[PDB]
Amino acid sequence: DQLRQEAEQLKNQIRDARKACADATLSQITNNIDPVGRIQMRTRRTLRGHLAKIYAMHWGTDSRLLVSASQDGKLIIWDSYTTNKVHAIPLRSSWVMTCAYAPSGNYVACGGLDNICSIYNLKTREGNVRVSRELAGHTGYLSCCRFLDDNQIVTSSGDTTCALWDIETGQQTTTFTGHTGDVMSLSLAPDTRLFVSGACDASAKLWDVREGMCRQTFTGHESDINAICFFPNGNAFATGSDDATCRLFDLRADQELMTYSHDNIICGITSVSFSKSGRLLLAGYDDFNCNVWDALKADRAGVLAGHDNRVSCLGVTDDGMAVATGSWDSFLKIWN
Amino acid sequence: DQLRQEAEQLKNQIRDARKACADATLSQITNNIDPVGRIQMRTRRTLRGHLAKIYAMHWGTDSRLLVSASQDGKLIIWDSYTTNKVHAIPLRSSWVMTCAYAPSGNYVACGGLDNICSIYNLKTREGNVRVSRELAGHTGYLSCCRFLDDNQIVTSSGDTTCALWDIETGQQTTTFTGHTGDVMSLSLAPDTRLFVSGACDASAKLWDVREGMCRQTFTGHESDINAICFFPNGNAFATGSDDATCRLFDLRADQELMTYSHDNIICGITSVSFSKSGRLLLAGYDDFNCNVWDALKADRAGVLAGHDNRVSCLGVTDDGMAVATGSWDSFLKIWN
Amino acid sequence: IAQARKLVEQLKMEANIDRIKVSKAAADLMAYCEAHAKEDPLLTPVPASENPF
Amino acid sequence: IAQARKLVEQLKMEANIDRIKVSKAAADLMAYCEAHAKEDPLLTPVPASENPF
Amino acid sequence: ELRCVCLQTTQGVHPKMISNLQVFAIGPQCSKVEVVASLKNGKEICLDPEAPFLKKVIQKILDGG
Amino acid sequence: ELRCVCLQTTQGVHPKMISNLQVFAIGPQCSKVEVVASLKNGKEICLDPEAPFLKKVIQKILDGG
């Protein structure tokens, strides 16, 4: 009972300190920057071959190779330039919710409702793709696998916790706890030393991969957070929730900078991605179309559209040349 | 001056005595006699051959031979049965106003504006008709010659007087005076001992052929008397005037009995004739048609019509079989 | 003075006339027209077989 | 009693953070997006001769 | 739909009563030649194309003088 | 007033283009025979009655088979 009072006063101290740092909103300082106009983006490629809903997609580090997981139980690696299928990996469980690509192109980790993160080796001497390691230890559905190196991966689950794994040994090196709801997404910072995870408790909190410490927590959303992605400089991140609102939080100021809500938007955000410059905030919505937000003025700088069903995944190449979108209509479209 | 008073009182005595004899009008006593109905008379013969107005006509004593005088100067004797012309006598003067036929059929006296009564002999040994005698002594136009015998004729003129002639010697045996206007007509009584003359002074007066005495005078007309004819019994006569009225005077009562005026009649009467019975009073009018009057009830018992111009002469046969009419259109028509 | 002397003389003779009531005179004229009524081919039409015209 | 003991401990570390005014943070994010702006093929369209897609 | 103009045919008519001869040749309308004779009475008849009568009639009509 | 149907005449027409031949004989309408040819084009022509062409045309049309 006494500690409960201590908990409350600590929140008041944080709120007062957080409010005292606020001097001017982001939309008030950059009011003199000229708008970026209309970003009209045209479909350049249409990747077909999936026979079920597409739930995840990750870009290769060379901005040419893609990976996509679907309910059909197939894992396809695409040549994004010539629309050729490089690999086709049959999964054990057809219920895959996330699917990641290694930064070196050697491995691919891709898992889902089976509570297991399966890692596949592409550069094998036998010419086929084999299941190198199956990571187990999560009691809930898996989401947002992210490779750190060729032998280190961070995973998120519905156990209200995320885990840091060692692919060689197979043991859970570090476990990050503190969430009070299913964790739906995570993103790795460019300096590969920090990451943020968005959970169902309407809170995203910054975690340290080396120490396993919740350095900071961020609030403001009214519903569960569905996606997250860092600003390109690794000093801010953007979240997407079922509240049909997008928000930009700053790690140094510990306060949200601006909101990306529009009166015509009803359905929540599914995916969040940034451009190479950090100016266009692309977000996928449940009303079958993606919107491009000017991340500095909260102005809709065009709409992608085109898809027939809910857009479930977004992806921007490392060089920023193209944007890949996946939806439940079993089609991947590449925009530019 | 004193005799003028004597003249006036004598008229008053006559008028009072004449009025005292009147007890009931003729139209009041015979009010129970049934009407004669409609006397529809049809044209049986049409005698043509005259080329001018017909001014006089007389019937033969045998009811078969006619005589007619016209302005053309011709005297024609007709066979009333077969419409043959027996004689054609050229006159000296074309202005003939009256024309008579002898009771024996031997002579024909026929004269006019020439102030001379010419007498023609029909039964001559030479086969032609010759002027036996021309009677002179009248200073005015002649009218209504009437034979008494083969050697005695009564004539009327515009000298306000009539004359009695002797054809053999040629001298005026008797002269009858008393009229104050032109004498337009006369008729001889059946007993050949009295006659009445109608003059222009609106008075007709009874004269004696043997004594030359004006036995009685009759008044009542408003205009000049144009024709006269006795009742068949020689006790009454009927007159026709320009007043468009016909009147019936009684010799014994010295008073008119009834008038034959109709509201639709405007023009005066030209000729007056009676039937053999003394019931139908035929009268010729200036409006081209003759009317038949029921002499006892003053009712129009039919109309002859047919003629085109003024009817100038009327004639009823001795046996009463037919009625002959002459007009200014140069046609004689025989009715029955 | 010598013209109207005969005028009063004529009226003297015309006044001394034995006159008869018109009632009797009217009946007498009615009797004659009724007596000699069967011999009038105009008042009553003659048969066509006895018509010279 | 043993569950919320770590809760206040986490809030103790989360309160001791060297915070920076949002005015400076907003400018820093503005500078990065303006500096690395010539190398964004999405904000400014790439020439068709340099478009792999 | 186009149809033939002569259902049944006659072979006997006096030439002196003929005023017009209209000849329809083989075509879409009908599969057979058909000659229609319009008379002075105002009536119409359908002659037999193949009878000898038609040829003589035509020769006479073209040689009135 | 009735009048002739053919003011001027033609003697040359290809038989294959002829669809109808209407012959008017000598009568009140006109003093001369007159033949009217209605073609497949929808036009009309007036042929020469006395030319040899008409007889051959009629014979051909009545002998299509």
Place this chain on the structure above:
Amino acid sequence: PFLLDAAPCEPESLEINKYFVVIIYALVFLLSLLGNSLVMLVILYSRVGRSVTDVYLLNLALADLLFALTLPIWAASKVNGWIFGTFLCKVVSLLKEVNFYSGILLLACISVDRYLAIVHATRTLTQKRYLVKFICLSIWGLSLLLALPVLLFRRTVYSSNVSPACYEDMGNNTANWRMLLRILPQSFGFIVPLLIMLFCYGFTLRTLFKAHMGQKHRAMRVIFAVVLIFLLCWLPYNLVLLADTLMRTQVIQETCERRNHIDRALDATEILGILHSCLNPLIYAFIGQKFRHGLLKILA
């Protein structure tokens, strides 16, 4: 090609002209019937003042009345052609032509009577104008004689381009015979009467200009009106007929346009001439005080 030179001339007719023609014919029928009946009534009701002019007007009115009585069937024929049969064609054509000839010749005879009455008033020739009965009888007989060809040589003609007609069938050369027969109406119907009328009325006017009568001017006006009415009624029809005759005889070049123009002109001029049955009572009879006074009396 050049074949267009040789092509049938399609006869042309319109229904608007049909409707107009029917209306005009019916109106003329009614007016002529009324006028002629009134004239006959006035003349015959009273036998007083039965003069020569009365007899001439009586015969003229009878002729015009018969013409009007025949008109309606002609109108129906113009509408839909002669469907009434050959016998009616013959009889109606006979009656119409007879009455037309009689009317014209009676107009000429009236002109002669006026010439005799005015110029030769004081002479002994004016006593030859009491022969009205014989003259009119001879005129009727001559009219009957001149219309026999119509009765004999007419029938129903059935054509293809045009509806049936009450035309003439004289044989193979019917056209030229019809052309010749057309000479009679244009000689005994236009030229001879016109010349007689002009001669008589001109000498009448010459006498009337030399006199001192007050009412000379109205007589001059009436005579001029009569002549002008006759010309307006009859000259166009004969001119069109002459043009048609020339066109058939090739004196005038023949073309389809001329044919259509002449047919329309024939129809119009026949309509115009048919008006002689309605205007004669006004021109010749009702313009006289005697007739008007008699009519007013009769209305009593």
Place this chain on the structure above:
Amino acid sequence: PFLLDAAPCEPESLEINKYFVVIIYALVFLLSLLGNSLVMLVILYSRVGRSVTDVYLLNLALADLLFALTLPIWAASKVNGWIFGTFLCKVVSLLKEVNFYSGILLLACISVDRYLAIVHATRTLTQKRYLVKFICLSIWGLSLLLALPVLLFRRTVYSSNVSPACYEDMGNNTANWRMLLRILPQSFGFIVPLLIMLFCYGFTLRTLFKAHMGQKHRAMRVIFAVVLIFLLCWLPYNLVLLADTLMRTQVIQETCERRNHIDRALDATEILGILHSCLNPLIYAFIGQKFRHGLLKILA
């Protein structure tokens, strides 16, 4: 006399029917254009839920739209005949016949799709209903192939009794060749599709009577309505055509009255069949909830 037995049978036509026909054709044109355009708009505006039925309806609406677009010239021809030339006769007849055949065959293919989807729902044969594109392409090609005779053997025909027509000229024996060509529309246009539809829909109804679905009754009603509409639209025209064929072949005695009756019946049944371009959008597409919801959304 007895010659009355041999007399031409005068073809008969009336202007009241002309006016009525024009009105009906114009109204059908407008209605078909509106319905087909709406269907195409709804289907093409959103690519979501592009199913086999959508493709079939798209092709059907295109065919009906082309038929309606060709209608007006046919109406004008019925009014005054083909004055527009031979080339237009060929092209319009080709387009009309092609679209008619395509519509019929697409109706049959829709019936087949429904049969496969319902009766063979649980089997492996239902996976053969994803070939809509190839099937429709083959149907269009076959329709084009079956309408070549119209393009090749049609032209303008000028007759005397009747106005010009866009008829067929195959040679001397054109009548019998036309009779034979008539077999194709009555075999590939009526009989084959009708039998296929009856078979498929009968087995569909048999399956639907055995099921416990609440909405079975409305499906039964819709299928019966479709079959009855097809019959009412097409059976009379083919029956009249068969009667005409028999009459020409002397199986049925030939008379003028029968000719006139059959011509009137042909006109009326062609008018009745032309109604398939206006009712198809209502029967096949608009009676579905999905299409109505899509239309209401699009009106936004």
Place this chain on the structure above:
Amino acid sequence: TLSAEERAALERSKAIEKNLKEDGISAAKDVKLLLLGADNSGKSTIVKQMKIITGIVETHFTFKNLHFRLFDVGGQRSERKKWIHCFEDVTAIIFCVDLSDYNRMHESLMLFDSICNNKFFIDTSIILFLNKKDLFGEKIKKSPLTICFPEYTGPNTYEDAAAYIQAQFESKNRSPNKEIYCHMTCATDTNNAQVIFDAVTDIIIANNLRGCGLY
């Protein structure tokens, strides 16, 4: 006409009719004129070519192949209303007026007024003759034209005085279809027959015009 005697009677009737018609033909070439006027007015000495022949007096002079019959009704001394209808068919009326008689001038005017407006003579044209120009010309100088006509106002010259008398006579016309042909005559005038002839011819045209229907 069945019997032999009746056949000759019909022949007699037809022979009579031929002479009746023949006499009518010879009675159509004559003009019947009526002479009227006051006494001593020259009504018996108009034409010096008299060829005469108490009561009615006839005169039958001829001129230009035309027979003129003049009927003098003076001397009857009776009521004119009873016998003036006999002359209803005369062609014209010849009236003679003496200009030198200032006392009978009013008597002459009464005669002209009665005759002109008579019912029988409503259409008969009148040929009015004004006689003795020379006697009137000398008389006016001695006595002005005011004792007879007190209403005279114009100049006392012969031309105005003579025309003033003429106007009074024509003021009594008061009827249409009737024309009064005036002429001034003297004792030594021989062309009186010519004046009558042209007036009669002029009158016939007017009657013929009405009969022909032109007027």
Place this chain on the structure above:
Amino acid sequence: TLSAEERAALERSKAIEKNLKEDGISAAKDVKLLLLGADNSGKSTIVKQMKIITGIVETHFTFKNLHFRLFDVGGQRSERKKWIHCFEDVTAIIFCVDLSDYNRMHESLMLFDSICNNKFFIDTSIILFLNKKDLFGEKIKKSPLTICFPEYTGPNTYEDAAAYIQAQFESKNRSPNKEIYCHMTCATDTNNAQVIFDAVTDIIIANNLRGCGLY
């Protein structure tokens, strides 16, 4: 596809696509059903022909040449809103209810109410199984059906009580185009596979009817 190596790469891609399409063909003959219900309700022992194969459990028994794949979602113990959309394309929903459990009956009703009215399962028909007739038949005699449902008013007989429970479950439908196929099952029932087969075939017809446009 110009270079020799790129020609073989295109050949590899086309060979991959052939197997991708072939695997899809073999994945169309199976029926995907979803198993739901409270614990100890027989949701793992419906059909005795199991042939099964912590997390998701599959069962792939076959019947009448048709492959039935049953997915048991129990044991996840997470928020259903995040992974229940994976089964949006299942043919039907199989719900198991234990009639002998009077305490979990209200818990089962909450599960049925949430699943039936879910936005993803608004058109998926439900095959509801009422298990353990015999156990319920014996239980009702000892304890009447009033502690669990105080609103019950009808007779305490088995027929009315069992039907009353069925009415409550179907009262939560509240949607069109969805049909609930009920069936009463016991422990010793072998024809559960037959009941599932006829319901699945009936569900396919309803979806096919809507697609064909008949309804």
